[PDB]
Amino acid sequence: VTLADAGFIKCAQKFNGLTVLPPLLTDEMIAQYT
Amino acid sequence: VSMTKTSVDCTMYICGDSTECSNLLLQYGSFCTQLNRALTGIAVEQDKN
Amino acid sequence: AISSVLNDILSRLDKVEAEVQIDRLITGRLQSLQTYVTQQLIRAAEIR
Amino acid sequence: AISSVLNDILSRLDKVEAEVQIDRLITGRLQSLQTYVTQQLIRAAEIR
Amino acid sequence: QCVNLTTRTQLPPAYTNSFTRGVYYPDKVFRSSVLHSTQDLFLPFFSNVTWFHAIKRFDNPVLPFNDGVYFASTEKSNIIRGWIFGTTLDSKTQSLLIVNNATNVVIKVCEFQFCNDPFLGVYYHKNNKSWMESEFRVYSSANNCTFEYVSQPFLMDLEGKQGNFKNLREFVFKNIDGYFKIYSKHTPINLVRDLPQGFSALEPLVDLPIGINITRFQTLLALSSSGWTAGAAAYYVGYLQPRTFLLKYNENGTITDAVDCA
Amino acid sequence: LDPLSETKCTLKSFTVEKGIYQTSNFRVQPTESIVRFPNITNLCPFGEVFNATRFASVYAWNRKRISNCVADYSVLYNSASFSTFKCYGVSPTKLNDLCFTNVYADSFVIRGDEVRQIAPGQTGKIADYNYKLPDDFTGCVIAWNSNNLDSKVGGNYNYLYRLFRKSNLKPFERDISTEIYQAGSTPCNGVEGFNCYFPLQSYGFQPTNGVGYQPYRVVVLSFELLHAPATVCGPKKSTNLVKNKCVNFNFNGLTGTGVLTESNKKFLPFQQFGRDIADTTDAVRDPQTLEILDITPCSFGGVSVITPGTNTSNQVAVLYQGVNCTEVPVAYSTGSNVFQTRAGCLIGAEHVNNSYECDIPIGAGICASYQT
Amino acid sequence: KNKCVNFNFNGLTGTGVLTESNKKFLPFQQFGRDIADTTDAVRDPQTLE
Amino acid sequence: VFNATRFASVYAWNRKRISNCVADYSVLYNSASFSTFKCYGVSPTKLND
Amino acid sequence: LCFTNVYADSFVIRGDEVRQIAPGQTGKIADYNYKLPDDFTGCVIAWN
Ligand SMILES: *C1O[C@H](CO)[C@@H](O[C@@H]2O[C@H](CO)[C@@H](O)[C@H](O)[C@H]2NC(C)=O)[C@H](O)[C@H]1NC(C)=O
Ligand SMILES: *[C@@H]1O[C@H](CO)[C@@H](O[C@@H]2O[C@H](CO)[C@@H](O)[C@H](O)[C@H]2NC(C)=O)[C@H](O)[C@H]1NC(C)=O
Ligand SMILES: *[C@@H]1O[C@H](CO)[C@@H](O[C@@H]2O[C@H](CO)[C@@H](O)[C@H](O)[C@H]2NC(C)=O)[C@H](O)[C@H]1NC(C)=O
Ligand SMILES: *[C@@H]1O[C@H](CO)[C@@H](O[C@@H]2O[C@H](CO)[C@@H](O)[C@H](O)[C@H]2NC(C)=O)[C@H](O)[C@H]1NC(C)=O
Ligand SMILES: *[C@@H]1O[C@H](CO)[C@@H](O[C@@H]2O[C@H](CO)[C@@H](O)[C@H](O)[C@H]2NC(C)=O)[C@H](O)[C@H]1NC(C)=O
Ligand SMILES: *[C@@H]1O[C@H](CO)[C@@H](O[C@@H]2O[C@H](CO)[C@@H](O)[C@H](O)[C@H]2NC(C)=O)[C@H](O)[C@H]1NC(C)=O
Ligand SMILES: *[C@H]1O[C@H](CO)[C@@H](O[C@@H]2O[C@H](CO)[C@@H](O)[C@H](O)[C@H]2NC(C)=O)[C@H](O)[C@H]1NC(C)=O
Ligand SMILES: *[C@@H]1O[C@H](CO)[C@@H](O)[C@H](O)[C@H]1NC(C)=O
Ligand SMILES: *[C@@H]1O[C@H](CO)[C@@H](O)[C@H](O)[C@H]1NC(C)=O
Ligand SMILES: *[C@@H]1O[C@H](CO)[C@@H](O)[C@H](O)[C@H]1NC(C)=O
Ligand SMILES: *[C@@H]1O[C@H](CO)[C@@H](O)[C@H](O)[C@H]1NC(C)=O
């Protein structure tokens, strides 16, 4: 599964007031629950 | 289970780097806030899911 | 509008002419956000 | 607009007067389709 | 000077397939790793292009110019040297002259009184063991001029090369709101008598705000006054159409492939 | 006053519950303006536009284009030869201080009773039938005596006006027509007819004529301002290329706001403005020193306020979402308690090593709480 | 009739296929309308079918 | 209509019915004698169509 | 209707300059000696 603009401190989306926010549980915290 | 969380500066999307457009955008009232609430309610429930 | 670029309209026209052109873009854009947020609120309910 | 019938605008007005009428019908009829597709996208989730 | 050159064999108007040739950069805007979609006056893909010869034969007619024109020549010995564009072609209105005389390329807009059969002509290896330009029979007069360009002086060869074609030269001409826009390309070839199957993009090399009506065009070739040898060249004319094109820019931002969306 | 006052103002309540609240977006302001244009040299064609051999007739007035040139009006305004020098959309002093998208010279000759009809909003046989200026005409009208240039002692009848027409012409129309005017009710076929007039008449311009009855050569400089990528400019403005700072930029007429940076993208020699997947301008060529600049709009994000309930405390922390701490100092700037998170910079909250149950969720594994 | 055409009846421009109706228009009417307010029948002005 | 010798007093404006005839409006619109020709439900160029 | 306060701005100008008295205009009356705001509420009156 591919991804885009995941929210980590790093164009077309960002440049226009659009933002993507990170999940609360990181993919490590998800894997500790799993 | 989830999707990407998004939030938008509705004033920067409609009127990014213009004050004349931002002063006209006030003629519409609540819509940019109501839109921010919607996307915040979507985003807050991705963590709930 | 005479352009989609907001800063161009603000140089091609004076205030009482530009307000008509800028309001086309405020109307259309705001309908684009209202549509995206409708699509996303419907989508988010499939993901829930 | 001066008519609900699109060809009756174009039978009476030239390009510069017609586009002020046709655009109303575009604006209202595209709001009608977005309303229908919103109602159908909401409905489809009742049936799913 | 002004003359009618009647010593020709009659051949039918030939046709060939313009495979994926005739795309041009539609704007001066950089793009890369993207499949950009645009509607403009492009040459339709895989369409029949009208084919002309110089050989025995010296095909040079006045042609329509409607929504702009694709022109291409597969060439040796630099035989295609110019074009005429305009609406009356007889100094009742202005017209555009493009010429490549052996010294340097000239572009001009004037009330040109063009000849009925216009041409350039060269003395073929006359004792001097050089090919020498001598006949410049295109216009009798030029009244109200309002644009002139001449390139920096040089020395292009008129040399009578022999063999198959080695130069391909592609051009698109558009006359929009008074802006006469030339897109063109050059690429090396090794072909007998047909337009090569391959993809090419035309860069905009010059734009002129000439402000005239163009309804037609004619092409100028290098030839005591009748009975002569034409150095051999093939050329092709296509008419552009409004057609949505999808354009693949590669990493280095160069249109690398295209799709004609109909 | 403070982020808590902004949350009270956001929520329209004088007391705020425990949580993390979105508030008005952070956005770096530009440091300065910058104009980057192609190097200019040669002067505009004034020695053609005003000192040409012969001029147009007013019935079919000339339009000459002014393009790829340096514009100077100080020669035109200081020269005592011109009896009229009037500007209808700019001040006549400011002409050197100003840049133009495209420019033209409407060039012709007229009689002094009719020079008044060249101004916008007029009527009479020149204004009605051959030269109408538009209501919003922006540009200038310039006129001078030419009896020493254009006249012959019999009257130089080479200069023609229009005297009849089917309608008053539309602004900037040029009418070439010579077809006969049907003055009576009957039609007219062929070259001539009874009680018809030919629609043109020439002027009686002689070197003995009194002032105002002399040929005046008129140039009307129509120009249009700022609204598009420009092809005429004054002898002045392009300014030094700053980099790595937020600026109000202008490249060839492409106005915007952003950070500028040296690009590793290559542009082929005919390409000027570089775009993204969404057709937004992501790069541009500097038109002087030919190098490619990355464009980025100046750093911005959501500003989220972490608060305990107002009933607990007025202390708050602030999250700059998806923004590197190094960029915040631009604007709590004290810090000594700042924290970069994957979610963005965190200010006013003290980072703790101890892992606790998530109280107020910040993002990317981080949470915050009010504790000793 | 029975072909696609760009019609015009008394300035009622359009595009469509014309066929002989069995709708019986009372004398005062030149046109019949649809639910969408578009004309779906017309009385020819020279032969009054 | 346009070339009658006496017109009406405006309190008693006269109304002629135009019927059973072909109306070449291009004649009036192309006549320079009319200082005003303002149409309110059609453009003047369209009147022949 | 009623008004909270009323002011009659009284002056002489050339007949070409009456158009400049309207809101959102430019030219030497509108620019240098008498400007109305873009939202002007009131009436402009002129007589020869
Ligand atoms: C415009 O002029 C300038 C010089 O006046 C040219 O820029 C110079 O380029 C060299 C090589 O990069 C630098 O060492 C100089 O310092 C530059 N001078 C200035 C003033 O920038 C520039 O090449 C000219 N424009 C074009 C298109 O060539
Ligand atoms: C915030 O920006 C700074 C740059 O100002 C980043 O620091 C760089 O990090 C890399 C990787 O460790 C180093 O190779 C650079 O030399 C650093 N430069 C400087 C000046 O700090 C920092 O990583 C960024 N932080 C985040 C979270 O994106
Ligand atoms: C541009 O020139 C063309 C050709 O001269 C004009 O079209 C001609 O118009 C006349 C008059 O109706 C016809 O008799 C010719 O047969 C037409 N020829 C062609 C090839 O079109 C055209 O009208 C001109 N355009 C403008 C804007 O003046
Ligand atoms: C190619 O064409 C140009 C343009 O017609 C010729 O240039 C002229 O040359 C003569 C003789 O040197 C000059 O007196 C003219 O003033 C030139 N005119 C222009 C506009 O350049 C040129 O001579 C031609 N070359 C050849 C070899 O015939
Ligand atoms: C873009 O152009 C560059 C330069 O022409 C290409 O990079 C060259 O690739 C060849 C073949 O591998 C090497 O021999 C050269 O040394 C490279 N140039 C340099 C200076 O590094 C590059 O391949 C092109 N990109 C694409 C996608 O075609
Ligand atoms: C159109 O023309 C037709 C004749 O060409 C007119 O119809 C005729 O009406 C008379 C009286 O009923 C009949 O005797 C004829 O047989 C009809 N004509 C034909 C062709 O059969 C008709 O009146 C005309 N249109 C209008 C509106 O008057
Ligand atoms: C440039 O010169 C030509 C020729 O002198 C002018 O063409 C003449 O124009 C007038 C006005 O329509 C006619 O009376 C003549 O019959 C035309 N003569 C020819 C030979 O065509 C042309 O008008 C001039 N243009 C300018 C801008 O001065
Ligand atoms: C091209 O010419 C061929 C004849 O060789 C013909 O069969 C074909 O239909 C033509 N196609 C087009 C698009 O003109
Ligand atoms: C035109 O010539 C006069 C002298 O005859 C000179 O003073 C003036 O500057 C010239 N103007 C232009 C635009 O060449
Ligand atoms: C909050 O604190 C105030 C006193 O500071 C008190 O009046 C109020 O009842 C308290 N309410 C709650 C729910 O804590
Ligand atoms: C957390 O502990 C590490 C050692 O494991 C230390 O380097 C760091 O300074 C500590 N952080 C705080 C905030 O005490």
Short mmCIF file of C-alpha atoms in Angstrom, two decimals, chain C residues 1-3 5 7 9 11 15-16 18-23 28 31-32 34 36-38 40 43 46-47:
data_model
loop_
_atom_site.label_atom_id
_atom_site.label_comp_id
_atom_site.label_asym_id
_atom_site.label_seq_id
_atom_site.Cartn_x
_atom_site.Cartn_y
_atom_site.Cartn_z
CA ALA C 1 -14.15 35.35 -14.09
CA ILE C 2 -11.60 37.00 -16.49
CA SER C 3 -8.92 34.77 -14.86
CA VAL C 5 -5.57 33.66 -10.79
CA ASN C 7 -3.60 38.30 -7.99
CA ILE C 9 -7.73 40.18 -11.25
CA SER C 11 -4.03 44.15 -11.14
CA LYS C 15 -12.12 47.78 -6.58
CA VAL C 16 -15.75 48.24 -7.80
CA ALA C 18 -12.74 43.55 -9.23
CA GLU C 19 -15.37 42.73 -6.52
CA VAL C 20 -17.63 41.24 -9.28
CA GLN C 21 -14.77 39.11 -10.69
CA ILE C 22 -13.37 38.02 -7.28
CA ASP C 23 -16.88 37.03 -6.03
CA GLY C 28 -17.06 28.71 -7.09
CA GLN C 31 -18.78 25.44 -3.55
CA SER C 32 -15.63 23.29 -4.20
CA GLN C 34 -18.52 22.46 0.43
CA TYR C 36 -15.16 18.09 -0.91
CA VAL C 37 -16.43 18.20 2.72
CA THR C 38 -19.75 16.59 1.63
CA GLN C 40 -15.48 13.36 2.87
CA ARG C 43 -16.79 8.72 2.91
CA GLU C 46 -18.18 4.19 5.14
CA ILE C 47 -14.83 4.03 6.96
#
